[PDB]
UniProtKB/Swiss-Prot annotation, chain A:
Present with 2180 molecules/cell in log phase SD medium. Component of the EKC/KEOPS complex composed of at least BUD32, CGI121, GON7, KAE1 and PCC1; the whole complex dimerizes. Induction: Accumulates in response to hyperosmostic conditions. This is EKC/KEOPS complex subunit GON7. Transmembrane segments: none annotated. One of its GO terms (biological process) is tRNA threonylcarbamoyladenosine modification.
Curated annotation (Swiss-Prot), chain B:
Component of the EKC/KEOPS complex that is required for the formation of a threonylcarbamoyl group on adenosine at position 37 (t(6)A37) in tRNAs that read codons beginning with adenine. The complex is probably involved in the transfer of the threonylcarbamoyl moiety of threonylcarbamoyl-AMP (TC-AMP) to the N6 group of A37. PCC1 functions as a dimerization module for the complex. The EKC/KEOPS complex also promotes both telomere uncapping and telomere elongation. The complex is required for efficient recruitment of transcriptional coactivators. One of its GO terms (molecular function) is chromatin DNA binding. Gene3D superfamilies: Alpha-D-phosphohexomutase, C-terminal domain. It holds the Pfam family Pcc1. Belongs to the CTAG/PCC1 family. Keywords: Activator, Chromosome, Nucleus, Telomere, Transcription, Transcription regulation, tRNA processing. The keyword Lipid metabolism does not apply. Component of the EKC/KEOPS complex composed of at least BUD32, CGI121, GON7, KAE1 and PCC1; the whole complex dimerizes. GO terms for cellular component: chromatin; chromosome, telomeric region; EKC/KEOPS complex; nucleoplasm. This is EKC/KEOPS complex subunit PCC1. It comes from Saccharomyces cerevisiae (strain ATCC 204508 / S288c) (Baker's yeast).
Length: 68, 84
Protein backbone atom coordinates (compact mmCIF):
# COMPACT_ATOMS: atom_id res chain seq x y z
CA UNK A 1 0.00 0.00 0.00
CA UNK A 2 1.15 3.58 -0.55
CA UNK A 3 1.47 6.26 2.01
CA UNK A 4 -1.63 8.52 1.96
CA UNK A 5 -3.08 11.65 3.47
CA UNK A 6 -6.49 13.19 4.02
CA UNK A 7 -7.13 16.94 4.76
CA UNK A 8 -10.22 18.53 6.13
CA UNK A 9 -11.14 22.23 6.76
CA UNK A 10 -14.16 23.99 8.15
CA UNK A 11 -15.11 25.62 4.83
CA UNK A 12 -16.36 22.18 3.75
CA UNK A 13 -13.28 21.13 1.83
CA UNK A 14 -11.93 17.54 1.95
CA UNK A 15 -8.82 16.65 0.09
CA UNK A 16 -7.17 13.27 -0.55
CA UNK A 17 -3.53 12.77 -1.36
CA UNK A 18 -1.93 9.75 -2.98
CA UNK A 19 1.39 9.75 -4.82
CA UNK A 20 15.51 0.71 -5.34
CA UNK A 21 14.25 -0.92 -2.06
CA UNK A 22 10.74 -1.05 -0.59
CA UNK A 23 11.77 1.47 2.10
CA UNK A 24 13.70 3.51 -0.46
CA UNK A 25 10.63 3.81 -2.60
CA UNK A 26 8.64 4.54 0.57
CA UNK A 27 10.88 7.50 1.26
CA UNK A 28 10.56 8.96 -2.25
CA UNK A 29 6.83 8.53 -2.08
CA UNK A 30 6.83 10.50 1.17
CA UNK A 31 8.86 13.20 -0.47
CA UNK A 32 6.22 13.45 -3.22
CA UNK A 33 3.38 13.50 -0.74
CA UNK A 34 5.11 16.28 1.18
CA UNK A 35 5.29 18.34 -1.96
CA UNK A 36 1.60 17.73 -2.77
CA UNK A 37 0.63 18.86 0.75
CA UNK A 38 2.86 21.92 0.55
CA UNK A 39 1.60 22.78 -2.90
CA UNK A 40 -2.04 22.36 -1.79
CA UNK A 41 -1.74 24.42 1.37
CA UNK A 42 0.21 27.19 -0.29
CA UNK A 43 -2.57 27.44 -2.89
CA UNK A 44 -5.12 27.67 -0.11
CA UNK A 45 -3.19 30.58 1.39
CA UNK A 46 -2.73 32.31 -1.99
CA UNK A 47 -6.55 32.28 -2.53
CA UNK A 48 -7.30 33.48 1.03
CA UNK A 49 -4.98 36.49 0.51
CA UNK A 50 -6.51 37.29 -2.92
CA UNK A 51 -9.96 37.27 -1.28
CA UNK A 52 -9.07 40.41 0.75
CA UNK A 53 -9.22 44.01 -0.50
CA UNK A 54 -6.29 45.92 1.10
CA UNK A 55 -8.06 46.38 4.43
CA UNK A 56 -5.01 45.46 6.44
CA UNK A 57 -3.93 49.08 5.98
CA UNK A 58 -7.48 50.39 6.44
CA UNK A 59 -7.98 48.36 9.58
CA UNK A 60 -4.92 49.85 11.28
CA UNK A 61 -5.79 53.27 9.79
CA UNK A 62 -8.93 53.43 12.01
CA UNK A 63 -7.19 52.27 15.18
CA UNK A 64 -4.65 55.12 14.78
CA UNK A 65 -7.32 57.78 14.04
CA UNK A 66 -9.26 56.55 17.03
CA UNK A 67 -6.14 57.23 19.06
CA UNK A 68 -5.97 60.81 17.70
CA UNK B 1 -9.24 29.33 19.15
CA UNK B 2 -10.35 26.27 17.03
CA UNK B 3 -8.19 23.37 15.82
CA UNK B 4 -10.29 22.50 12.86
CA UNK B 5 -7.91 22.36 9.89
CA UNK B 6 -6.84 18.69 10.03
CA UNK B 7 -4.65 16.38 8.18
CA UNK B 8 -4.01 12.65 8.67
CA UNK B 9 -1.06 10.95 7.31
CA UNK B 10 -0.86 7.06 7.02
CA UNK B 11 2.51 5.43 6.49
CA UNK B 12 2.74 1.68 5.66
CA UNK B 13 5.90 0.03 6.84
CA UNK B 14 6.94 -3.58 6.05
CA UNK B 15 6.28 -4.96 9.59
CA UNK B 16 4.33 -4.24 12.78
CA UNK B 17 7.70 -3.89 14.60
CA UNK B 18 9.08 -1.38 12.18
CA UNK B 19 6.00 0.82 12.76
CA UNK B 20 6.19 0.44 16.53
CA UNK B 21 9.72 1.51 16.52
CA UNK B 22 9.15 4.43 14.16
CA UNK B 23 6.53 5.66 16.57
CA UNK B 24 8.80 5.35 19.56
CA UNK B 25 11.68 7.13 17.85
CA UNK B 26 9.54 9.95 16.41
CA UNK B 27 9.80 12.76 19.01
CA UNK B 28 8.22 15.86 17.60
CA UNK B 29 9.11 19.08 19.36
CA UNK B 30 7.48 21.76 17.18
CA UNK B 31 8.26 25.44 17.41
CA UNK B 32 4.56 26.11 17.20
CA UNK B 33 2.33 27.05 20.14
CA UNK B 34 0.29 24.00 21.31
CA UNK B 35 -2.78 26.32 21.23
CA UNK B 36 -2.22 26.55 17.40
CA UNK B 37 -0.93 23.19 16.37
CA UNK B 38 -1.19 19.68 17.69
CA UNK B 39 0.13 16.35 16.60
CA UNK B 40 -0.86 12.84 17.73
CA UNK B 41 0.73 9.72 16.44
CA UNK B 42 0.46 5.96 16.92
CA UNK B 43 0.67 2.67 15.03
CA UNK B 44 -1.70 -0.01 14.12
CA UNK B 45 -0.15 -3.22 12.75
CA UNK B 46 2.36 -2.22 10.13
CA UNK B 47 0.85 1.35 9.63
CA UNK B 48 1.94 4.55 11.36
CA UNK B 49 -0.90 7.04 11.87
CA UNK B 50 -0.12 10.80 12.36
CA UNK B 51 -3.05 13.15 12.98
CA UNK B 52 -2.42 16.97 12.79
CA UNK B 53 -4.92 19.60 13.96
CA UNK B 54 -4.29 23.34 13.48
CA UNK B 55 -5.98 26.70 13.57
CA UNK B 56 -5.12 27.49 9.96
CA UNK B 57 -3.35 26.47 6.84
CA UNK B 58 -0.23 28.55 7.51
CA UNK B 59 0.51 26.83 10.79
CA UNK B 60 -0.38 23.42 9.37
CA UNK B 61 2.03 23.82 6.41
CA UNK B 62 4.94 24.67 8.70
CA UNK B 63 4.17 21.82 11.14
CA UNK B 64 3.44 19.00 8.68
CA UNK B 65 6.46 19.44 6.46
CA UNK B 66 8.81 19.41 9.42
CA UNK B 67 7.43 16.20 10.89
CA UNK B 68 7.45 14.51 7.54
CA UNK B 69 11.18 15.29 7.46
CA UNK B 70 11.67 13.41 10.71
CA UNK B 71 9.73 10.45 9.40
CA UNK B 72 11.85 10.27 6.23
CA UNK B 73 14.97 10.23 8.37
CA UNK B 74 13.61 7.27 10.34
CA UNK B 75 12.75 5.51 7.01
CA UNK B 76 16.28 6.08 5.66
CA UNK B 77 17.82 4.65 8.88
CA UNK B 78 15.57 1.64 8.76
CA UNK B 79 16.47 1.08 5.07
CA UNK B 80 20.15 1.01 6.00
CA UNK B 81 19.72 -1.35 8.97
CA UNK B 82 17.41 -3.95 7.37
CA UNK B 83 19.81 -4.47 4.47
CA UNK B 84 22.69 -5.81 6.49
Amino acid sequence: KLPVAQYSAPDGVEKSFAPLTYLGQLRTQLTGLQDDINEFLTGRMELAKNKKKAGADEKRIQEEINQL
Amino acid sequence: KSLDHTLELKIPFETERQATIATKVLSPDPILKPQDFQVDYSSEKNVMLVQFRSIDDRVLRVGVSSIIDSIKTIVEAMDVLSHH
